[PDB]
Amino acid sequence: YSKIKISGTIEVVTGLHIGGGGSPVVRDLQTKLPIIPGSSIKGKMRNLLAKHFDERVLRLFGSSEKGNIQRARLQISDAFFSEKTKEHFAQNDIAYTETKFENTINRLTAVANPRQIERVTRGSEFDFVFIYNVDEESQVEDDFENIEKAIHLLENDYLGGGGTRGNGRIQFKDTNIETVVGEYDSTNLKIK
Amino acid sequence: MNKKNILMYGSLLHDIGKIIYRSGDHHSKLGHQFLSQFSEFKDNEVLDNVAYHHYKELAKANLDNDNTAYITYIADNIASLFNFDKYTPLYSVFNIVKFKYSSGNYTTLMKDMSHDLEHKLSIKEGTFPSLLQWTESLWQYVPSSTNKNQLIDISLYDHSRITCAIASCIFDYLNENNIHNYKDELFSKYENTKSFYQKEAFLLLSMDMSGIQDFIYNISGSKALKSLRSRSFYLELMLEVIVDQLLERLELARANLLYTGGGHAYLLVSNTDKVKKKITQFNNELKKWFMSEFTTDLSLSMAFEKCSGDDLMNTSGNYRTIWRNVSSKLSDIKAHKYSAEDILKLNHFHSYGDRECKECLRSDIDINDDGLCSICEGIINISNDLRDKSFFVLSETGKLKMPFNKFISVIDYEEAEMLVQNNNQVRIYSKNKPYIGIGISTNLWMCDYDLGVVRADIDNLGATFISGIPEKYNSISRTATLSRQLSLFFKYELNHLLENYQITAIYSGGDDLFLIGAWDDIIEASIYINDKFKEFTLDKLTLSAGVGMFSGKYPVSKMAFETWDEFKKNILEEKLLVLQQGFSQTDEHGKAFIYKMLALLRNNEAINIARLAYLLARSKMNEDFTSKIFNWAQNDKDKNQLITALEYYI
Amino acid sequence: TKVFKLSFKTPVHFGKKRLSDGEMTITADTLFSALFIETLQLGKDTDWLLNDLIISDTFPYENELYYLPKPLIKIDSNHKAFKKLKYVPVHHYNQYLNGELSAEDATDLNDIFNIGYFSLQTKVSLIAQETDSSADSEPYSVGTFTFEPEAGLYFIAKGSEETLDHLNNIMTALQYSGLGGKRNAGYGQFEYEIINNQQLSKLLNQNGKHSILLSTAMAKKEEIESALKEARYILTKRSGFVQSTNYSEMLVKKSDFYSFSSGSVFKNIFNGDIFNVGHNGKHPVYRYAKPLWLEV
């Protein structure tokens, strides 16, 4: 029984908005640096990978509410600013959050009522960790094919709110897959 | 009449003649003459009791070696050069830790009490609580002793109540301990008299609700407001019914109750073997009940301690020693709560159970429709019935389940009457309403008035209850009156003070203040309450309070576990006002401009100070407003206060 | 007899009654349950680590200060400053047991006790008919705790050397699983380090007349009568559901169990037992009740 670790970093290509406060964005109540929750990653990934088609959705994330019980096989954790993004923004003196002013146009009236929505800065990097509990040897290839297709979809989609309006596009870089428990080889599994 | 009832009805009127003399248009002999015209109180031994409450009078009354008045003498002595000024103004005890005199007032009170005494008062075995209530209604601010040389802080109601209490305790102690010629037991010689003060004839008893917090704050459902006002009230009424039922057992009067509130109750009872045996049995039955429904959420512990009457007269400050000792015994008999067979029974019941009430976070209780148990639904019923109806009835059927196989339902005053002539074994508990005079009229005090949440604790209350006024005012009487004053403050004054505010009162009393409502309103009411309290405590006692902003539809069980001159004068009055005027005069300063101000301010840097200068320059405020803002921004204390004030603006 | 130190770096939900509840420390019940579940997932043998291992509850730490719970001992003097206090660090523990702690010292110790803060994070659930048609979202709340960069929790375990080697292997397995509630949603991973602190060892290896119960225990049937002779204790209804026992999770729920808290004081020692809370199931479900005694 082995535990596979999928680690990497994600870049904010266009501004990001999770906004649990709202319209603030989620942060840590002491460090005052924004975070991207694991619940967001998991929810959007599940919605995409399911809409792509089921039993596989049950297998990767686990539902256990339909008269049969399946334990989650993929664990997703939060992400945080890397040291690299922090140091770069400090040296070049860049704030960590941008605030976009927005506006709405009424019809038959054409009066504008403005908005104020906070957004994570472009170029910021988040470091993430996933875990894959391989409970069946003969299915790791299939499950990483599924997670590959899911990450491929998320590459071409958005996280958080207002993505149709132009924000949330992310990128995935520097993914490494290592086996941290047990004696299962993982030098052939692949994620972009 | 039962001789105990004779002690009661006589004692509570021993110093009645004072109001009559002080009247002038109208002491022992005078009171004797006054009571002597009325058919109901035409009992004669009560007349003897009243007419002979002092040493000189008793010297020649030639009364029997057993005549109730002697107990009255010792009781008044225990509860307590002599030029009484009829106009002496009563003083508030809170200073040492005056109220609103003239002659005609007393005449008016004479009229009023004759009116009530012809038309409201009547003599039967069970009307003593009613007599006590009318005394409470009429006398709470008529000074008891008006000695020019004493620190006058006792109302005559307090003096009478404690005298009646002590008289009851003495009577039981003497009747039980095989003494009958009380004239010779007590009065004969001062040395023998002094011994009687020294004999431990009194027991002080304590109570404590164990699991207040986790029972009141386990709510997650959509009726958060409706349940909380009702759950708190159910727990309160549980405490009240426990104490009343105990008093009924010990055959004692409602006077012996000295304090109720929160979870504590103090009772002064007799120091006999009979009383102690009953107390043990009643503790057994209560604990068995409370296990039979809750098993951890609520439990009651009682403890008692022998005390000698000499200690009640503040002889050696020993009142403080004995009071602390009983407190320690309570806090150390809440340790060993469950016997061996009990804990076995708790663990070996494999029972078919359903799951946790959505409203009431509890699994053990047995749910039903809408995922709610019967108890939670009864709580919801009483919640619905609270707002429109005021009287609360203890009966065999009811709606909610009370301790000793009783139940509560809700009625109206006409319905209460209809139950009264029905002669059902009832008690009426009211919504802060006197002038009831209906059956067992028991004006129980509870502040029923109807996001922001506010919690407050009296900082100096442990000492005040315990240390009190040092070395000279530490009787039972004076701590009792202090207790009554704090209780009445938190159980009437909140109701009145909260009127102009959009707030509903959840759980208030003792030293806990729990109010919830709109954000702005909570702040304004909190300031008003702090000031009005500092008025009533003459700036002797301080309050610490916390207010937080909580979003709607949060589980109120979770918001509760989260939760002066400086804030009023400096933040609210000056900075907030100038800021509000500034934004009112100049439009277009929406949340965007204010939030850029925040963005500059929270990062405490000088380059940000220059940037803020640029921003204020680009605004169109008057030079005074901009200048004041910038000068405040240069200073740390001022800038924090400015941040708080403008945050309040939004 | 080694002790384990836990660092988290991700906020953790630990739970008492509802998902919006937040708790800082957890008991040997949840810990032993986690070790059992990871042993079974590994497919290792369970007998060795069932009836030989003794685990203490979790207890927080700060930068270089370690903490143990307040003994419910009868101190004879305020009765206020001590009530607001929960934990007493290892430096001053013998001082507390012998009355060498003063009210101003109590205020100071309470003042220094900033070892984490609480929070409620909001979330929404759009699996509902928002997929299908006009239908409201159903926001829910979770309760979390976050530690400052030098805080965490620590264990105390004892047993044979072989048992501790197995415990090390299982802990290595567990550090990449969670130890809390919403593990799969991104809460509660940790890295652990084994350090030998001289002072805590000294405290654990005394000899006295009283005993301070550091875990949650319940005496067996035939010892409780003599166990409760002179004691000061708090009972806690410990409940919860079970993982993979029968068809419906909602229809499976452990029978409630009461055990003494993690600060009780006793005269006569009792050994505990791993008690079943099982019924209507396909496999036994274990709850832990075995004391770790501190003898002074």
XYZ file of C-alpha atoms in Angstrom, chain C residues 33-161:
129
model
C -9.051 5.595 15.819
C -6.775 7.221 13.244
C -3.869 4.913 13.997
C -6.209 1.944 13.684
C -7.619 3.094 10.348
C -4.160 3.698 8.903
C -2.940 0.326 10.149
C -5.846 -1.335 8.355
C -5.277 0.685 5.184
C -1.641 -0.391 5.224
C -2.853 -3.960 5.582
C -0.599 -4.584 8.562
C -1.400 -6.720 11.605
C -3.562 -5.097 14.253
C -3.140 -7.324 17.310
C 0.274 -5.933 18.233
C -0.880 -2.321 18.271
C -4.250 -3.043 19.906
C -3.460 -4.318 23.391
C 0.044 -3.009 24.089
C 0.131 0.731 23.268
C -0.711 3.573 25.652
C -1.395 7.002 24.145
C -1.887 10.314 25.897
C -4.167 13.008 24.574
C -2.877 15.837 22.431
C -1.368 18.800 24.195
C -0.311 22.059 22.550
C 3.095 23.688 22.392
C 4.574 27.055 21.451
C 8.148 27.954 20.384
C 10.052 26.149 23.146
C 7.324 25.729 25.770
C 5.378 22.513 26.271
C 2.012 22.344 27.947
C 0.001 19.942 30.053
C -3.574 20.260 31.344
C -4.583 21.710 34.671
C -4.874 19.141 37.454
C -8.297 19.372 39.040
C -6.668 19.512 42.466
C -8.238 21.142 45.504
C -6.295 24.337 46.198
C -7.233 26.246 49.364
C -6.869 30.011 49.153
C -10.089 34.703 43.995
C -11.356 31.386 42.591
C -11.553 33.400 39.350
C -8.092 33.614 37.797
C -7.575 29.875 38.066
C -10.975 29.178 36.519
C -10.146 31.019 33.294
C -6.965 28.936 32.998
C -6.790 25.651 31.134
C -3.129 24.715 30.626
C 0.068 25.099 32.656
C 3.474 24.797 30.937
C 6.074 22.260 31.997
C 8.312 24.853 33.692
C 5.803 25.785 36.387
C 3.868 22.530 36.706
C 5.374 21.319 39.979
C 4.964 24.879 41.228
C 1.247 24.630 40.488
C 1.001 21.274 42.209
C 2.624 22.778 45.322
C 0.952 26.181 45.456
C 3.937 28.144 44.178
C 1.751 29.919 41.589
C 0.422 33.393 42.356
C -2.518 35.285 40.919
C -0.304 37.723 39.033
C 1.623 34.722 37.735
C -1.678 33.209 36.614
C -2.498 36.401 34.735
C 0.941 36.394 33.117
C 0.778 32.739 32.077
C -2.662 33.318 30.592
C -1.288 36.372 28.797
C 1.498 34.355 27.159
C -0.869 31.598 25.986
C -1.408 32.872 22.426
C -0.871 29.597 20.569
C -3.425 29.797 17.773
C -6.605 31.489 16.633
C -10.052 30.362 15.514
C -11.968 31.028 12.316
C -15.086 30.172 10.332
C -14.600 29.765 6.569
C -17.744 30.018 4.420
C -18.473 27.598 1.602
C -21.230 26.883 -0.913
C -22.538 23.642 -2.390
C -23.611 23.789 -6.033
C -24.173 20.076 -6.616
C -27.878 20.807 -6.191
C -30.451 21.765 -8.832
C -28.281 24.786 -9.622
C -26.913 22.153 -11.966
C -30.480 21.610 -13.217
C -32.589 24.769 -12.931
C -33.261 27.863 -10.826
C -32.416 26.666 -7.319
C -30.725 28.436 -4.449
C -27.220 27.629 -3.355
C -26.873 26.054 0.086
C -24.040 27.780 1.944
C -22.478 25.848 4.797
C -19.782 26.663 7.323
C -16.674 24.939 8.641
C -14.691 25.624 11.794
C -10.926 25.766 11.610
C -7.897 26.442 13.764
C -4.554 27.803 12.606
C -1.276 27.673 14.516
C 1.415 30.324 14.524
C 4.661 29.285 12.820
C 6.018 27.679 16.008
C 2.980 25.932 17.502
C 1.440 22.484 17.192
C 0.451 19.473 19.264
C 2.437 16.702 20.926
C 1.869 13.096 22.067
C 3.244 10.928 24.834
C 3.377 7.212 24.104
C 4.809 4.264 25.960
C 5.190 0.547 25.477
C 7.735 -1.983 24.381
C 10.425 -0.942 21.936
